Fold this sequence. Notes:
Layout: E1 16-20, H1 23-26, H2 39-44, H3 62-75, E2 80-84, H4 87-90, H5 100-115, E3 119-123, H6 131-137, H7 145-160, E4 166-171, H8 173-182, H9 203-230, E5 233-239, E6 242-245, H10 250-273, H11 278-284, H12 293-299, E7 306-309, E8 313-317, H13 329-332, E9 336-338, E10 340-341, E11 344-345, H14 360-372, E12 378-382, H15 393-397, H16 400-418, E13 423-429, E14 448-450, E15 457-459, H17 461-469
Parallel strand pairs: 1-2, 1-13, 2-3, 3-4, 4-5, 5-7, 6-8, 7-12, 12-13
Antiparallel strand pairs: 8-9, 10-11, 14-15
Helix pairs in contact: 3-5, 7-9, 8-9, 14-16
Zinc ion binds next to loops.
PDB class: hydrolase
Keywords: beta-alpha-barrels, glycosynthase, transglucosylation, hydrolase
Assembly: monomeric
Amino acid sequence: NWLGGLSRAAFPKRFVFGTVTSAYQVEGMAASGGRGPSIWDAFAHTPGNVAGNQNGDVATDQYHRYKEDVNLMKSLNFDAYRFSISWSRIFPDGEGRVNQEGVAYYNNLINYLLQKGITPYVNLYHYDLPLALEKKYGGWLNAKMADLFTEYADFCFKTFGNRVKHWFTFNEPRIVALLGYDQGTNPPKRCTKCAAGGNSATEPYIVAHNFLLSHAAAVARYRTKYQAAQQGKVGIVLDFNWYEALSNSTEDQAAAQRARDFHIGWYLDPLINGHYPQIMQDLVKDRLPKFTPEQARLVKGSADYIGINQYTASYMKGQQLMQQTPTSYSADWQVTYVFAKNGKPIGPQANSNWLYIVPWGMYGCVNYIKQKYGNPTVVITSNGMDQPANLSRDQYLRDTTRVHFYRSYLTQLKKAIDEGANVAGYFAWSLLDNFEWLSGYTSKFGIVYVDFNTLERHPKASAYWFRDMLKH
Length: 472
Ligand SMILES: OC[C@H]1O[C@H](F)[C@H](O)[C@@H](O)[C@@H]1O
Ligand SMILES: [Zn+2]
């Protein structure tokens, strides 16, 4: 049967199912309703930066249509909705003056979700630093971000926290560090060779440290000022793609483990254990910032749950560890990516070239976190796959590959949960086709099709799959 034995009965009691978007990717009204620009507004308006020179000015226009989209998610039997608050929609300059019109939007959205029985899971940050903070402070290179972020978070807790009980601070700080400061392909476009300046060997580590310190500061403020009255929770969202040793050799197994540590351990070892991974300390040395004992104690235990964004898996091949002049966070891992084993690719690709369909990577990642980090509460905060540009409406709707994707990946998640993994929820990326960053509107991740000419929504087969699987 097309559900493949899946239903709410196949998951733990009270397990949360939801869909996910982010502010810049779906809201539109980017320069309206009082919103100030983010670093993504500037980046996307520069010719050549995004496919088709497209941008999020209008996006899906969820800003005007949010009640349609909430009605849709309820009709599809979801329990929850993960979305983000745009920092610059609340504080156009990132600090100081509050944009009351922006505040009213999120109040209206939160209130409608609750009216319709959908639980809001709210991200404070999703790639969209206010441009004013980038220019005035240097963004995530500046340790002052901890204070700036805490003040923003404090405002959101005070204003929405009587209703919002499930918060996340950040989304994928690894990708900000990697693409923003190592490879220089996302804003602020910093890297050793880059026109904007930078240093691919140092800046990614500075940025990660500042995200951890900022997360910890915001959580400390929540716990000391707001938690007694509000009785909510705050976590963080981290990307994790699986790494599998190419062979059982000592060096291939070590390579795969080095990649896990440089990928997820970079954040989880501080958040769970209060220190960076030993291998990162060993290889990165004085380029890796040191937490003071006090900072380490603030960071440790500061996530009430761990959001994992999970998509794909890679084979890893090793090498003898070498003394090397530092060049980048990427080169620091000393690993070799391989995309086939025994003459077979690890999986077929979706539309995005990085996205190999490997359902067992979901099991890999979840099992790994369970066994290594004392089985922390995990929420799968994004998982999904994309269709290419230029299909007909009917072709978008008949998304049989995405149906197969969710069935297989959720079957693997079920396997990990049935073995004891403490997973509390699962969220599909995305509710809607939307603005896919460098790919603009050429990549379609939604379970609901969005016609970008007319802005009409049409549920795809995968939406109806969820509706059938999730019926109460
Ligand atoms: O690449 C697909 C998707 O991956 C992650 F979930 C990011 O948080 C999203 O912003 C992005 O659109
Ligand atoms: Zn509109």
